[PDB]
Amino acid sequence: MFTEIMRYVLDLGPTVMLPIVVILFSLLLKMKPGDAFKSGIHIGIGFVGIGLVIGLMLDSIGPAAKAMAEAFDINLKVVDIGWPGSSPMTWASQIALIAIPIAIVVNLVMLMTRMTRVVNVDIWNIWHMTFTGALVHIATGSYALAIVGVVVHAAFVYKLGDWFAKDTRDFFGLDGIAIPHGTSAYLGPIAVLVDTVIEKIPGLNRIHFSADDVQKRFGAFGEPVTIGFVMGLVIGLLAGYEIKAVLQLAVKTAAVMLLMPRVIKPIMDGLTPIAKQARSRLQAKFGGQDFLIGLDPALLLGHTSVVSASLIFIPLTILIAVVTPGNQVLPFGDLATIGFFVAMAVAVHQGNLFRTLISGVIIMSITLWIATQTIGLHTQLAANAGSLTGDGSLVASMDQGGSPITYLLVQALTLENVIGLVAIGALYGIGIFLTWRRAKRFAAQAES
Amino acid sequence: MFTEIMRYVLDLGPTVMLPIVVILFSLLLKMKPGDAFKSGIHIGIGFVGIGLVIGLMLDSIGPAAKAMAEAFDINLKVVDIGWPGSSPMTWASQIALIAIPIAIVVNLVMLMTRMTRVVNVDIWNIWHMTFTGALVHIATGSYALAIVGVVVHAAFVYKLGDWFAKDTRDFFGLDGIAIPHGTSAYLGPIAVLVDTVIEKIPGLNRIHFSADDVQKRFGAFGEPVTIGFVMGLVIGLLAGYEIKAVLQLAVKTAAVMLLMPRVIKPIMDGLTPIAKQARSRLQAKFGGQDFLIGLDPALLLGHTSVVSASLIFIPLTILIAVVTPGNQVLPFGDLATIGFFVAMAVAVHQGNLFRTLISGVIIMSITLWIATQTIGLHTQLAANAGSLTGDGSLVASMDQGGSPITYLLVQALTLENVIGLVAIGALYGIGIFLTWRRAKRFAAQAES
Numbered sequence: 001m002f003t004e005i006m007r008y009v010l011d012l013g014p015t016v017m018l019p020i021v022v023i024l025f026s027l028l029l030k031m032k033p034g035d036a037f038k039s040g041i042h043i044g045i046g047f048v049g050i051g052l053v054i055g056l057m058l059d060s061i062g063p064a065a066k067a068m069a070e071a072f073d074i075n076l077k078v079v080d081i082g083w084p085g086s087s088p089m090t091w092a093s094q095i096a097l098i099a100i101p102i103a104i105v106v107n108l109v110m111l112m113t114r115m116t117r118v119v120n121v122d123i124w125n126i127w128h129m130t131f132t133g134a135l136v137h138i139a140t141g142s143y144a145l146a147i148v149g150v151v152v153h154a155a156f157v158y159k160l161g162d163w164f165a166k167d168t169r170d171f172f173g174l175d176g177i178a179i180p181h182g183t184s185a186y187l188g189p190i191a192v193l194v195d196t197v198i199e200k201i202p203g204l205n206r207i208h209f210s211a212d213d214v215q216k217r218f219g220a221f222g223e224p225v226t227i228g229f230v231m232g233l234v235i236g237l238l239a240g241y242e243i244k245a246v247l248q249l250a251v252k253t254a255a256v257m258l259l260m261p262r263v264i265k266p267i268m269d270g271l272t273p274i275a276k277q278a279r280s281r282l283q284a285k286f287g288g289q290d291f292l293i294g295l296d297p298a299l300l301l302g303h304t305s306v307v308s309a310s311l312i313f314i315p316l317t318i319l320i321a322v323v324t325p326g327n328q329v330l331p332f333g334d335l336a337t338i339g340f341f342v343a344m345a346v347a348v349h350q351g352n353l354f355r356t357l358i359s360g361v362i363i364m365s366i367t368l369w370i371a372t373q374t375i376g377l378h379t380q381l382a383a384n385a386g387s388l389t390g391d392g393s394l395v396a397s398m399d400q401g402g403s404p405i406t407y408l409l410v411q412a413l414t415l416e417n418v419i420g421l422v423a424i425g426a427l428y429g430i431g432i433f434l435t436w437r438r439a440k441r442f443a444a445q446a447e448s
Numbered sequence: 449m450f451t452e453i454m455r456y457v458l459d460l461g462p463t464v465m466l467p468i469v470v471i472l473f474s475l476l477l478k479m480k481p482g483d484a485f486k487s488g489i490h491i492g493i494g495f496v497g498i499g500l501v502i503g504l505m506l507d508s509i510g511p512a513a514k515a516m517a518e519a520f521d522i523n524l525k526v527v528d529i530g531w532p533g534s535s536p537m538t539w540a541s542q543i544a545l546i547a548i549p550i551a552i553v554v555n556l557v558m559l560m561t562r563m564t565r566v567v568n569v570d571i572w573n574i575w576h577m578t579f580t581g582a583l584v585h586i587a588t589g590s591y592a593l594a595i596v597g598v599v600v601h602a603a604f605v606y607k608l609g610d611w612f613a614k615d616t617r618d619f620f621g622l623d624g625i626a627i628p629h630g631t632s633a634y635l636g637p638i639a640v641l642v643d644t645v646i647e648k649i650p651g652l653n654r655i656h657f658s659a660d661d662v663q664k665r666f667g668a669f670g671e672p673v674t675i676g677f678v679m680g681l682v683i684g685l686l687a688g689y690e691i692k693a694v695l696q697l698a699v700k701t702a703a704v705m706l707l708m709p710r711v712i713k714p715i716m717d718g719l720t721p722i723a724k725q726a727r728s729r730l731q732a733k734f735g736g737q738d739f740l741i742g743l744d745p746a747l748l749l750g751h752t753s754v755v756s757a758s759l760i761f762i763p764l765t766i767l768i769a770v771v772t773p774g775n776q777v778l779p780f781g782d783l784a785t786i787g788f789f790v791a792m793a794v795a796v797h798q799g800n801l802f803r804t805l806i807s808g809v810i811i812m813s814i815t816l817w818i819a820t821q822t823i824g825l826h827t828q829l830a831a832n833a834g835s836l837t838g839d840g841s842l843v844a845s846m847d848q849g850g851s852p853i854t855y856l857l858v859q860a861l862t863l864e865n866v867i868g869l870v871a872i873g874a875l876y877g878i879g880i881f882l883t884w885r886r887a888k889r890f891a892a893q894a895e896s
Contacts, residue, residue, distance in 0.1 A: 011692060013692075015696065015699050015703075019699070034669060037669070041673055041674070041699070041702055044702070044703075045673070045699075045703055045706050045707070048504075049707055052703075056496075056500060219482060220485075221482055223486065225489055244456070244459060244460055244464065251464060251467070251489070251492045252496060254489055254492070255463075255496035259497055259500075262711070263707065263710070266706065
């Protein structure tokens with residue numbers, strides 16, 4: 001009966017079950033029924049808006065990006081599928097129904113001993129941990145090792161969401177909300193390492209560039225919506241699209257970027273009183289820092305800089321896919337939502353487009369190489385799920401196939417590529433240590 | 449040479465060609481190119497948001513309303529198709545590509561003679577005039593009568609948009625914007641007549657009921673979002689939907705109602721400088737009242753009362769379709785957007801839900817009676833367009849097939865139903881005289 005009720009809860013959707021969870025939390029906080037109902041329905045309001053705008057992103061950008069990818073290069077054989085094609089594949093795994101209870105238990109345990117302050121409530125993003133566990137099970141061949149991998153990934157994701165609280169609170173303005181899930185969370189340490197390296201280099205640190213500089217230089221034409229329209233038009237032109245298609249796509253890009261914050265806003269409007277009462281009661285009873293709430297990484301698309309970088313990086317990603325040595329994966333699926341990769345990079349760089357570009361280039365190269373490395377495991381997963389054609393063609397993805405955590409876990413658990421494991425582990429360990437030191441320093445400075 | 453360029457302009461879409469028209473108008477007003485481009489792109493963004501929200505509303509309500517209709521009654525045989533099924537039928541007619549130039553010419557002629565002040569720019573809503581012209585051509589059998597029917601319909605809708613300027617400016621807050629198209633425009637006079645009749649009878653006028661009263665009565669549960677959620681929930685429950693589907697549908701109803709004004713706002717945000725400069729220059733050059741701009745009737749959905757009426761009236765109109773004498777049309781297609789019918793009724797009644805309900809009942813019964821009356825013409829139009837199944841099943845629509853103007857023109861030109869012609873003509877003429885007198889009185893009062 002547990003599997004059936006878990007499947008029902010999953011099928012309820014983020015727009016129904018999450019408002020129920022928020023209402024229950026508010027009721028546990030001793031509020032009036034009206035406030036809890038309003039907060040829940042507002043959160044559902046924002047999430048429905050997010051889903052609609054993301055669907056617009058997909059059906060507007062996907063076709064154009066894919067057409068440009070075919071037009072540019074044909075050397076790369078393996079074709080990316082991205083998160084829209086990976087998440088249903090992941091949900092068909094045999095551990096898809098136990099990963100959610102395991103993650104919930106580990107979150108409760110880490111909250112009980114005050115090792116974290118992130119109360120994750122988005123259970124539709126647990127498929128990341130499910131994917132890592134499935135890959136570990138496929139590679140090593142042991143169920144217990146897969147469970148250990150899921151636990152490790154969940155703990156690391158929660159700790160990373162805790163560490164990046166300052167950037168979400170300040171740069172994005174999402175006060176009281178933390179984002180532990182998504183590709184932005186675990187690609188943060190690379191951006192932190194790149195920022196530290198650039199800061200160390202004299203002369204290069206003097207280069208500053210932001211959308212505000214663009215607006216100042218170009219007058220009324222530098223206003224962000226104009227630059228988004230221009231980027232959409234350029235992407236349409238590069239894809240060989242017709243004039244009417246180019247204009248429609250550019251208008252769609254400007255529209256999605258303009259409407260992202262308008263649909264995010266109801267979530268904050270509904271969650272403000274909940275956070276206020278939480279800080280009023282739970283912080284008084286227990287103590288410590290603010291109790292953050294985990295949410296979907298789609299909330300990071302509200303900032304104009306994030307979506308601007310997303311539009312800019314599609315041709316940049318396609319260019320990177322040709323120059324990266326030992327690369328066979330052609331970015332095909334998540335090019336529409338490539339902003340999820342470099343959102344935390346933009347937040348860390350505080351909108352500095354030069355350092356954002358450098359960090360995004362390095363992140364794209366690293367994730368493309370990793371996705372090239374993890375192909376046999378991914379095609380084995382595809383065969384296991386049954387969503388694979390009979391031609392025997394390989395498959396790969398970058399949203400979760402190329403995550404550094406999964407590659408590091410698999411390499412450390414089976415030791416098949418020691419040189420790549422050593423290199424990626426050194427880079428990611430330096431990034432993690434740097435981001436932890438930076439988070440501790442920021443917390444100490446804010447406290448003092 | 450004109451046919452394919454007109455087809456291309458039509459296919460450009462409201463999000464591309466209309467911003468180009470706005471930019472050209474702004475340039476003719478001697479603004480800087482940057483501000484003109486910003487206004488045009490903002491209007492495009494608003495229209496894209498309108499399209500997205502309308503698509504969500506359709507995909508959320510349509511199936512639910514259709515299931516409601518199937519579950520409730522089976523006595524009615526003819527199945528409505530609504531505007532989504534009528535617009536491709538109308539645009540495939542023989543007079544499809546002449547109607548747009550005819551409407552533009554008649555608008556220019558009426559503007560030059562100072563007979564009207566509505567500068568219609570939405571060329572995608574001309575399909576109402578195309579529909580009435582095609583119906584007249586089918587009934588009478590001559591091209592010239594079709595042309596004169598198109599001209600008469602265009603002049604009537606332009607004058608109706610002129611007369612309802614105060615309601616749009618004040619009640620909906622759309623300053624400088626007129627709505628000559630849509631079912632709301634030509635179903636206004638019935639609402640005006642009903643309001644006058646209610647005012648005449650003492651005691652009935654003393655009943656006042658508005659959404660503000662509901663909010664005051666219900667405290668923390670009387671907000672528009674909460675009542676919309678309740679209406680969605682009851683619609684799902686009475687339709688035989690499952691619990692998850694019911695909750696998702698209710699959340700989607702709350703979604704459309706709450707997100708309507710947020711996506712409505714960019715249109716005014718972009719159009720305000722255009723109207724300001726028009727008032728500064730064109731009024732000084734020529735004189736007279738403001739030069740209003742015709743747009744989509746979907747803008748009336750921004751008001752919360754209109755959406756609330758749209759949700760409540762669906763079971764109401766389905767019930768009305770059973771008790772209406774001599775009715776054979778089952779409302780099936782435009783149940784999703786039933787709010788377009790009673791928008792102007794709400795505007796006339798100033799949000800009085802009691803008079804809104806009475807006017808809506810009268811309008812529903814009347815328009816269903818016409819929709820039953822005009823069935824042979826509609827199925828002949830379907831056969832001409834080629835979109836008719838070979839089973840011989842009758843077709844009928846109520847958004848435009850049941851509109852009073854087309855029925856009145858057909859009856860006046862062919863004289864096939866004297867009793868129906870005289871009844872509908874008397875009712876509509878009394879409504880038109882009353883609304884013209886009301887508009888003249890309002891203009892005189894504002895001038896004084």
